[PDB]
Structures are given as structure tokens and as C-alpha cells.
Amino acid sequence: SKVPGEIAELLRGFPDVDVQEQAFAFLTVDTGGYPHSALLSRTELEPSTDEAVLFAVVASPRTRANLRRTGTAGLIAIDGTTCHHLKLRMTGSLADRGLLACIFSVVDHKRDDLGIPLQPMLFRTSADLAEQEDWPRTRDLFERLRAGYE
């Protein structure tokens, strides 16, 4: 399958600082079988150029361990009247200090739409966040991912 078109458009590209962005719930499963979440943004989510796969860069330690243990993940993405629910299977990964760069195949996509306009989770980017989430290293890892995938 592929990254759904509307989701590729929601995630593609990287924000500058001081800009309103959607926070995407990035889901995993912990060792007791409980669902687990982290917030990611366009900075840590990028489709491949052909949209076949979804790349992610994850800093949060428990999410990273969950991915290493089960290889399963999911995403919530909000766009207009649609809540997109994704399920993701990790097919490869690359570690760089506290960051895990991941390649995901989409294994399921549900368009959850009741005809009711939705607002996404939102936050404003900042120079502090750029430091907390190590944007320079995330960017580098995404280019390493792009290069290896191709």
C-alpha cells in the first residue's frame, strides 16, 4: 500500500520556528499491552518522495523502545471533517544518539468522518523546541532515510 494522499500532504515538509503546526498523536504499544502515545509534528514525520512509506524520527525513549519491541505504531491526523486513523508496521530503523529514525509501511487507514468540522491538536514551533527535539539531527536522519530508501 502507500501513505494516503491526504496524509502525505499533511506531513510533508518541515516548519520553521514560531509557526502554528498540527501535533499528530503517534501511537505505540508498551510491554503490558497498553496503548502508548507521543506527540510528533511535521518536523519528525515525512513521507518518502513516492509516498510508498512513512519516515519518522522519534526521541521519546519509551516510544522508541515500544517500536523496537513490537514494530507496531499508529497515527491520528486531523484534516477538515476527517479524522485519519493509521496503523503502521516498522520495516527498518536507524539510531543516532537519542533519536530513532524509522521506516513504516501503512497497514491500515480509516477515514473517520461524521461531517463535523474538526480542529487538530495545535502548537507553535519555537527555537527552544528545535533544541529540545534536536531539529538538526532529525533533518540529517531524514536525509539519510531518503538516501537509503532510494
Ligand X SMILES: Cc1cc2nc3c(=O)[nH]c(=O)nc-3n(C[C@H](O)[C@H](O)[C@H](O)COP(=O)(O)O)c2cc1C
- Residue ranges that bind Na ion, judged by CB under 5 A: 11, 42, 46
| Grid cell listed for 56 | 519518522
Strands 54-58 and 122-124: unpaired
Residue 122 binds which one of a second copy, ligand X, Na ion, none, with CB within 5 to 8 A depending on kind? a second copy
Q: Is 44 in the site for ligand X (CB under 6 A)?
A: yes
* Cα 21 to Cα 124: distance, rounded to the nearest angstrom: 6
Q: Is 68 in the site for ligand X (CB under 6 A)?
A: no
* Cα 87 to Cα 64: distance, rounded to the nearest angstrom: 16
- Smallest distance, Å, CB 146 to a second copy? 26
Decide: helix, strand or coil at residue 70: helix
- Buried b / exposed e over 106-136, threshold 16 CB at 10 Å, is beebeeeeeeeeeebeeeebeeebbeebbbe
Cβ-based nearer residue to a second copy, 36 or 137? 36
Print the binding letters for residues 43-82 with a second copy: x by CB under 8 A, - otherwise.
---------------------------x-xxx-x-x----
* Cα 31 to Cα 83: distance, rounded to the nearest angstrom: 27
* Cα 71 to Cα 97: distance, rounded to the nearest angstrom: 20
- Smallest distance, Å, CB 23 to a second copy? 7
Q: Is 34 in the site for a second copy (CB under 8 A)?
A: yes
Which residues would be at the binding site for ligand X (CB under 6 A)? Answer: 23, 38-41, 44, 58-63, 83, 85, 110, 112, 114, 116, 123, 133
Which residues in this chain contact a second copy in the complex, by CB under 8 A? 23, 25, 27-30, 32-39, 70, 72-74, 76, 78, 83, 85, 87-89, 107-108, 112, 114-124, 126, 128-129, 132
